[PDB]
Symmetry: C4
Subunit: 455 residues, 4 copies
């Protein structure tokens, strides 16, 4: 039994010396790295084509339909007078009606198909306002029924000019229409072009009732297969990836089964559920997970190429994660050699103390996150949302973008002085505490762990 | 006595094992974290509504009243010819008179009400100039009485076109008016809209007499309750927060009282005002302070919701600080376990040596601050004020925004070469000294303190 | 033999004390630093003149030929309507025909000379489209022969106005022409001006068929000697550099030969190919390589000055690399003194363990590179290409540009939420792993190596 | 003798306990910090007034005289057609002639006074071109006499329209004129306004002959006292600063004299010029230097206030440096206490090894500086000059602005691929070597020095 256990933990070279066993798993891992990386790049070609089509069409829509739009102005684009708002609305509708004559793209109109369009209608121009809206700031009074009433005008593709906006109780104005186009660039990748439908929404938003009405354009893209097109290998490579990952999965499962059997034998021969886990190869769990992800991504990729699916983002995430895991998994064979295994050995020693330290640090970090989000968020562009606040604080801990964070508040030093002073205290205390105390101790834990495994 | 003292310092689990005492304080602390954080977010909704209303109205005013204004131009917006200045002034007044017909907001005029407005006047257009102002650069001479004379023209809401500016002795021109509006967006938060009065000040500033007259617009917002409005739970949650914090305050006060009594007994039984303080729980002082802040903020929040107060900024600071303290205070229960208490133990060991080190470092830091502020401030955008200089130097110590700091001075290398050379020496010496000597020693102090408490 | 070996490893001062040997190599090294640095600066003058001529002419071409072009707009410059595209094309051609009357430069036309120009033609205006291009998005159908057909119109320098673009199957439009000019600024450097031919390509690119057609201008510069010009020391300095480097090369080769002979004698007297290499001076290998590079660069520089060559970039790389190596090589004489040799001794001790550590780290780094490039590249401006991804990740490891990297993805939080969440996980995991674990261990290896050689 | 030597090195408290000596120097140092800092701020008021006047007038000149100028465009402002250049030149001259009617400032003309103006002339419009300039790129030939000929047109203040530019051999065009104005804002500081003369130079630069002619405006300001002006304490405070610094200088000189006498006695009683220097107080040398600088700056400040001098920059440098030294000098009294003297003790121990390390590091740093400056400077905005290259490399060592440095070269990846690859190698090697090897060893030296003096 001792000999078999000693053999179980031997390295591939040692196992070869003992039983002449071929290192099939190692060769499979190298081949997997190569083929999985190549597959990811090949998929990236199609993924890029789709993303580019959507984005470029959206930019073209912004230039075509938004009066006086220019690049980079999305965040500030707004109307400020009644005349400006009417001109923007009418320009959008007129450009919609003129699209076949002016656009560099080839678009087809879509009619009907449910709300907000009536049958035969291509464009819906809707204004939403309060049901009852008497507003008299001169007498400091108002009488409001806040139920929202929607009034829509339908425009057929080639009356809307009589639109009368109820400015004082207006909630918003929207323009809805759909356009069909063909992603011809796919021909460059030897793929059949797909048929895209873009749902275009233009919003003139008055929810703040502040005298400033921001204007935005958004699109939703739906991909469908075209009807019997005509155009005057990846399947085999995907099959090869499937077979390599399947063989790897089978071999790793066999190894895990043998490990479980040996663990059972060792426990039985002992005349704690921590020494048993020493028979479990975590690297093989990782390899099995990566094989599962790779095969799922490859099947999804085949489905997309066959035009049964269009979930490019999910497929890209699956294949990218599997590629990273495949590259990482080859470290399993460096664990047998001390000089090459510093990172993993240090991680194993350090992880418990690091997690215990994080227990204390996380409550402080979260307290700062919530305080900053709510107090500074209305005044500071970097504190708008909780995820943004976490990004800002994490970057500050690493010394990044610090003066700019201070300078964003300098405008409030004259306007809201108390908030400015609080922001000073908040930023100085956070940076000092986390860079000089917390991070130093974190690094000290890691380097001490390394010191214990140095020799 | 020994048994009672040993019981006093036992952990919640140990106290339970001894006397079966329930950990009421710990459960209260967890509940407090939850409810205080939720209350802060709920308050943030109303706070954001108010701040957004003010800011958006101000941006709309800039676009409405400043001729040729565009976003991002606030710092450089200026006039350079007499014709430009007259056109800007007249455009502001004309837009004020046209506001009801052109604006997307609904505004009401305000008349009279003291200086600078006469009774019945809505807009005051004032020019301020020297009492006597003979200026003859051709003969290198002047005769000035610098007493400022103000001349104002009053405009009623729906003669100012005859304004004649005394350019050569002009100090500034101001336009003052007030507008009333209603913050309707509060309806989305199930709140009754408030009535806002915006005091608008437009300044054409000639104090430098340099041929460039910067133009700015500023607003002051005053919030009042509207007169008998009509619109076709937070109070209970605030009450719950009050009760949780009150119970926590009472329990912590009881613990502090028992600690004081035990300290008195121990001192008396000894047949220095440093060993006595070992009977004082600093965490309970922190909890009492946080309870006081939370209750004050909650009362202020209730007052604001009832429309008796409008101090959003103070309330936000109170509630945010209390939220951070509540999150931090739960660390008290990790102090009983060495593996989880590294940060606090290191802080306690390190603080004295760190403060002594700061004694020496602070004088150097302040010397650099003053020197940079006065010598480089007129030439360097990052050295304009003392607080800005401290922000710049602190960021430099952390390696942030360094090349940009150097590059701001590169323009003076041809204009003011001596100042450029001095700035080179200043920046290089500061960065070298503080990053490589001071900060290294600071971190060494902290990690040495950690080394002493490692085991 | 022992005495000779002991003498071989003596320092220059010790060798002087032993045999009175003059330190010729050291003086040569100092002289080399001086002359090589001066030569590099003198070459930089001519290199700058050439680069400036090319760049400034290209900017002028962009302003002359691109309708409505402004600085900084290169990345977004595009057409969005048929009318815009036609106007841009015709403006480019009209400006080409008007160049002699409007341009501040003096340009000569080039005719014929092969494709795409016919004989006598100066400008070629070509449109490229699909051979068969029926596109019917209304019926979700198409019939395409993707073979590209090119149709070109030839314009002689002082019919193209009848150009009819096949928009629905258009691949791109190009404008090709060549202009000849003379780089007169070389007179300021006492050089004879060269004759430049600029090949100008203007591309209106429709390969995405997205309704947005980006417009770009690119130039290729060909330098030739002018025909018998008339204009109403560096050769000697280059000769001096050649002689200094040649003498240094000869002395270093002699030293290497003596070292090889001594190694042979020592091995023979021993009644492993690692102890023998201790007789090889790596510094002398470096010096020989630097001499070779310096001489090659100097010969190339002489050829360029004589106008036999025009390879400014290659010459600059040769001379710059040789200058860096010459400056570095003087450290050879600090190796004899422990206090001055910390860097080299630490490097020698640390290199093996560092390379072994890199073996493990590189696979993780590459996995992250590929995953980020393919998954995030279509959405993130910093992940467009593999080299850019490596630049971004390497900068992140050093704490640089981190918040901006996070913020680039914040736009997708509403559009592509799954990709945004993946980007969050990717960035947080990469930064945490590499800054806090990998880099800490790397630095620990280096400082431990230094600890071993401290005394 | 032993007792006297022991007393010599005593601390102020010990000297008080020994002989009851009053700590006059310490009180003087505190008073000096206060008064010198206040004096620096008071001077900063006047310094800011002067700098602001110059800068604002220059910006106004740019807006008045440069056709189509806007803020931030200085680096790219240029002409590209003959018509543009003529319009810019004529606009500048026309605005000069119209200045009294259009400008918001009050300016007086200056006539004559030597070259380039003739007597009675206010504006000089000069074109500079080659003496002989035949340029024929069509035949690849030229005939040039590069002697520069200047032709000037004189304009009196209220023929230049017939200007004919020799475009093909034009070197540049300049416009020179002077304007007199009065810095009235000084009244706000209770100072008499000065009389400024601005020398304005407008350059249309064609030295590159590239078809792009950059346009710039520069000013030189000369300050003079006005002739018998009329306007309808700092001298005493400056006197107080002088007296405090003089008393401090005298006391420090007395201390240095006593130290020298004691050193002589100790050496004589010994029946090396390193033990003798232990009798020299370096802090007192620093204090004497700071007193000298403070007094010089105060005398210069008095001269400027009296209007005998106008050297604001030199005075500001003197006073700022003296302020920093005064703040630093109070550390002398913390040297007597080990806990407060960590920084100085560590510096004293570390300096020799640090300087020896710098000997080796500096040659590598300089090699990189020269190589980068010459090879990358023409392509990279951050490598234009040697000082800029040093700024960039120093910032990179601290991890600052790294991705931007990489990204500046990404444009050459298609244009000049070899230079791009070299830049990749250069940047990666520099950053790796200096951040991970050099800086780590530097910090290790400093922290080891601290370790030696820890106890
Ligand atoms: C008796 C059990 C059931 C039958 C098992 C039959 C054999 C089978 O399945 O794989 C054997 C090897 C496995 O290849 P591989 O997994 O690389 O090899 C095993 C591992 O090295 C394992 O160590 P760890 O990796 O550390 O767990 C070791 O304990 C095993 O020795 P042991 O056998 O003495 O226990 C090896 O057989 O693979 C081939 O030799 C070709 C694979 C197919 C190639 C197809 C090409 C078209
Ligand atoms: C005799 C003194 C006056 C009368 C005191 C009567 C009791 C009273 O007030 O609180 C008792 C506990 C306190 O709860 P809590 O404060 O969590 O518990 C105490 C702490 O654990 C304290 O340790 P530190 O936290 O380290 O200071 C410990 O010394 C005390 O033991 P001791 O008693 O032997 O000294 C505990 O009683 O709380 C409840 O059991 C429910 C509270 C109300 C819940 C209302 C629900 C609606
Ligand atoms: C017998 C072998 C063949 C004949 C060799 C004849 C001599 C010859 O070539 O160079 C001698 C020195 C070399 O100058 P240099 O190379 O500086 O000097 C040698 C090195 O110091 C070497 O040590 P490393 O540098 O550590 O390898 C050392 O072992 C040699 O001693 P050794 O001789 O006992 O072995 C030295 O001669 O150079 C001149 O003295 C002037 C050079 C020309 C100046 C021209 C001015 C216009
Ligand atoms: C016999 C030598 C010539 C005559 C010297 C006469 C005395 C004179 O000049 O200063 C004495 C002190 C000096 O003040 P101060 O310099 O602060 O005091 C000296 C220092 O503490 C010195 O130590 P270090 O600072 O470490 O070098 C110490 O050795 C001297 O002791 P010693 O005398 O036993 O050597 C002290 O006298 O200053 C005043 O007591 C008022 C100053 C004027 C205030 C004016 C107010 C309007
Ligand atoms: C940046 N690192 C510390 S570095 O990468 O290790 C390094 C890089 C370059 C050089 S240098 O010698 O070429 N010169 C140099 C060039 C450009 C800017 C600064 C310098 N030095 C100025 C002197 N400074 C110094 C001296 C004594 C002490 Cl007590 C403390 C100090 F900080 C060290 C920096 C050395 C190290």
């Amino acid at each position: 039994l001792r000999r078999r256990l000693k053999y179980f933990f031997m390295s591939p070279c040692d196992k070869f010396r003992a039983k002449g066993r071929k290192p099939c798993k190692l060769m499979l891992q190298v081949v997997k790295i190569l083929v999985v990386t190549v597959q990811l790049i090949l998929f990236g070609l199609s993924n890029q084509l789709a993303v580019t089509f959507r984005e470029e069409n959206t930019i073209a829509f912004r230039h075509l339909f938004l009066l006086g739009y220019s690049d980079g102005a999305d965040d500030t684009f707004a109307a400020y007078t009644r005349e400006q708002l009417y001109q923007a609305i009418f320009h959008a509708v007129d450009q919609y009606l003129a699209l076949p004559d002016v656009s560099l793209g080839r678009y087809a109109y879509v009619r009907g198909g449910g709300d907000p369009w009536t049958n035969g209608s291509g464009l819906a121009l809707c204004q939403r306002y309060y049901h009852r809206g008497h507003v008299d700031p001169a007498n400091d009074t108002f009488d409001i029924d806040p139920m929202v009433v929607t009034d829509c005008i339908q425009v057929d593709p080639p009356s809307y000019k009589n639109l009368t906006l109820k400015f004082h109780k207006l909630v918003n104005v929207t323009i809805h229409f759909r356009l069909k186009t063909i992603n011809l660039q796919s021909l460059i990748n030897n793929e059949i072009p797909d048929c895209y439908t873009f749902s275009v929404l233009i919003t003139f938003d008055n929810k703040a009732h502040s005298g400033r009405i921001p204007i935005s354009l958004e699109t939703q893209a739906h991909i469908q297969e075209c009807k019997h097109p005509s155009v005057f290998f990846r399947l085999l490579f995907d099959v090869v990836v499937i077979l390599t990952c399947s063989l790897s999965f089978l071999l790793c499962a066999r190894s895990l089964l043998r490990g479980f059997l040996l663990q059972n034998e060792f426990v039985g021969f002992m005349w704690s559920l921590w020494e048993r886990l020493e028979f479990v190869n975590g690297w093989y769990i990782l390899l099995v997970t990566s094989d599962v992800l790779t095969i799922s991504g490859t099947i999804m990729k085949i489905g997309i190429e066959a035009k049964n699916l269009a979930s490019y983002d999910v497929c890209s995430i699956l294949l990218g994660t599997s590629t990273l895991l495949v590259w990482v998994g080859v470290i399993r064979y460096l664990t047998f050699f001390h000089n090459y295994n510093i990172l993993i050995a240090t991680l194993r020693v350090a992880l418990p103390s690091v997690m215990r330290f994080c227990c204390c640090v996380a409550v402080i970090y979260l307290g700062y996150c919530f305080c900053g989000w709510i107090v500074l968020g209305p005044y500071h562009v970097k504190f708008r949302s909780l995820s943004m606040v976490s990004e800002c604080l994490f970057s500050l801990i690493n010394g990044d973008d610090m003066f700019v964070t201070f300078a964003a508040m300098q405008a409030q030093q004259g306007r809201s002085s108390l908030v400015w002073l609080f922001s000073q205290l908040y930023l100085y205390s956070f940076i000092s505490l986390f860079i000089y105390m917390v991070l130093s101790l974190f690094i000290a834990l890691i380097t001490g762990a390394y010191d214990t495994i140095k020799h």
